[PDB]
Write a protein that binds this ligand. Structure first.
Ligand code: PRO
Ligand code: PRO
Length: 507
């Protein structure tokens, strides 16, 4: 037991074929006895012999035993301290190039244990080039092994942009995604999805992950019984989804997201809405699919259930906004919001306690709902016009006398845009006129921002079809600024300005 020890060292530190080798197959034996190991690591000359012969050997039984020895040692916070003080990490790492399974296995786990409990280990693995070696090991097939490898990477990448970028350069994205769409073993899916989550916040990793088919691979696991796996997939998907606009094969993912809106889980709902919102920005096929599986229905139920939780309603309202314009079934989707009792909650969201990003999104949504003639009347009846006008008036004031991520100039355009559309209905024009908005619309012709000139001239154009309003618009002195705008680089502005002008001088 306790006494006869550094005999076995000398032999390992020897420079001969069988001599050091068969001497290895002994400390291995001795390391296996938990109280005999708890004493073996005390001699740094003994510790270091193990390391050396490991880095420089040729024997499959030799390596196995030296690794295993270190494996077995890495269980005591004294073993760890010893392996560290000795310099195991560069050798262990160097061992990640070996072709003998059981050696890889011992190396990875030892590094894993060091990475978990040993002060200073993360730095030394990076310095040894361990990230690159670990990425290259991702093509293996034993799941316990990949679990441990991906966890090493997670531990190294977390909070370390340098490590994230090296992972990128070694082809991590592709290799981690292949894992997500190949295996079923929860523990490994979960840790891989955590590496991907850590990489998904990096501006360079994100497109690389999206190009490897990340969105679809993460999509595959959204119905797993494991809640931690689903949630991690949801967060990664969300971080990535602004970069995923050009991706195809999105049908299954899109369908599951809609279902997930039904969920009792708040973070589930919040992510599915935020993902659907992003994946539906600009890409009209995505609009099509989400409408096809009942997305309008689901998004409305979600807005109704969220009440005043803006982490939910804001992205759900943004999604609804995307789904209600510029695609083959926009029109059906504009109707459907009304048919599922959406109109009263949408107008409500214009009122406190709603914060600006929500209000902007909601005004945008109302703009689009108004393109549908059968929404004219209920939007009016629900109170949309007076609030829109108040939001317009207040925001124009804030513009003149000089917020929370949104510029009042966008509220001005959004509200004037919505009123432009609402103004196609004759009763709406009466309400808009009664609110004495004409002076404000005329002032908005002088805006520096073209998009504001456009909606202002557009809405005046709608008002000017009624004789009384045409008279009013003239009495505001609209002729002069409309006259300069006939020459706008923006053809939207020029065209409306001539329609208003034409309706005024019919006298
Ligand atoms: O969804 C939520 O929880 C946000 C945060 C405060 C207001 N509503
Ligand atoms: O966000 C706010 O504080 C106010 C409430 C209504 C208009 N904007």
């Amino acid at each position: 037991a306790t006494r006869a020890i550094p005999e076995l060292t000398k032999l390992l530190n020897d420079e001969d074929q069988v001599v050091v080798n068969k001497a290895a197959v002994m400390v291995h034996q001795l390391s296996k006895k938990e109280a005999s190991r708890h004493a073996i690591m005390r001699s740094p000359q003994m510790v270091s012999a193990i390391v050396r012969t490991m880095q420089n050997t040729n024997d499959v039984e030799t390596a196995r035993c030296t690794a295993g020895t270190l494996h077995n040692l890495s269980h005591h916070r004294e073993g760890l301290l010893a392996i560290f003080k000795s310099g195991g990490i560069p050798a262990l790492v160097k061992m990640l190039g070996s072709p003998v399974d059981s050696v890889l296995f011992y190396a990875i786990t030892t590094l894993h244990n060091l990475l978990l409990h040993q002060e200073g280990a993360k730095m030394a693995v990076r310095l040894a080039g361990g990230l690159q070696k670990m990425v290259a090991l991702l093509n293996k097939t034993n799941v316990k092994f990949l679990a441990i490898t991906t966890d090493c990477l997670q531990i190294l990448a977390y909070g370390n942009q340098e490590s994230k970028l090296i992972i990128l350069a070694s082809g991590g994205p592709q290799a981690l995604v292949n894992i997500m769409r190949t295996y079923t073993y929860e523990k490994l899916l979960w840790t891989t999805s955590r590496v991907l989550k850590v990489l998904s916040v990096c501006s360079s990793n994100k497109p690389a992950i999206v190009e490897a088919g990340g969105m679809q691979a993460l999509g595959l696991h959204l119905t797993d019984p494991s809640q931690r796996l689903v949630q991690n997939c949801l967060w990664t998907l969300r971080n990535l989804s602004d970069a995923a606009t050009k991706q195809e094969g999105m049908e299954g993912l899109l369908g599951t997201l809609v279902q997930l809106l039904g969920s009792d889980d708040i973070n589930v709902v919040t992510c599915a809405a935020g993902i659907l919102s992003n994946l539906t920005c600009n890409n009209y096929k995505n609009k099509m699919m989400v409408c096809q599986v009942g997305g309008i229905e689901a998004l409305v139920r979600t807005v109704l259930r969220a009440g005043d939780r803006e982490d939910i309603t804001e992205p759900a309202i943004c999604a609804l906004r995307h789904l209600t314009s510029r695609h083959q079934e926009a029109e059906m989707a504009q109707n459907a919001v009304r048919l599922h009792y959406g109109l009263p909650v949408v107008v409500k969201l214009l009122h406190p306690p709603s914060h600006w990003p929500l209000i902007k999104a909601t005004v945008g949504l109302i703009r689009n709902l108004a393109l549908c003639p059968a929404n004219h009347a209920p939007l009016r009846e629900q109170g949309a016009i007076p609030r829109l006008v108040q939001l317009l008036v207040r925001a124009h004031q804030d513009t003149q006398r000089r917020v929370e991520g949104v510029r009042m100039e966008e509220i001005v355009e959004g509200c004037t845009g919505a009123l432009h559309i609402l103004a196609r209905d004759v009763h709406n024009r009466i309400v808009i006129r009664g609110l004495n908005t004409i002076p404000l619309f005329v002032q908005l012709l002088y805006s520096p921002i073209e998009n504001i000139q456009r909606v202002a001239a557009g809405v005046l154009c709608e008002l000017a079809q009624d004789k009384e309003a045409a008279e009013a618009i003239e009495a505001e002195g609209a002729t002069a600024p409309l006259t300069e705008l006939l020459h706008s680089r923006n053809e939207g502005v020029a065209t409306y300005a001539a329609a208003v002008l034409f309706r005024m001088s019919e006298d």
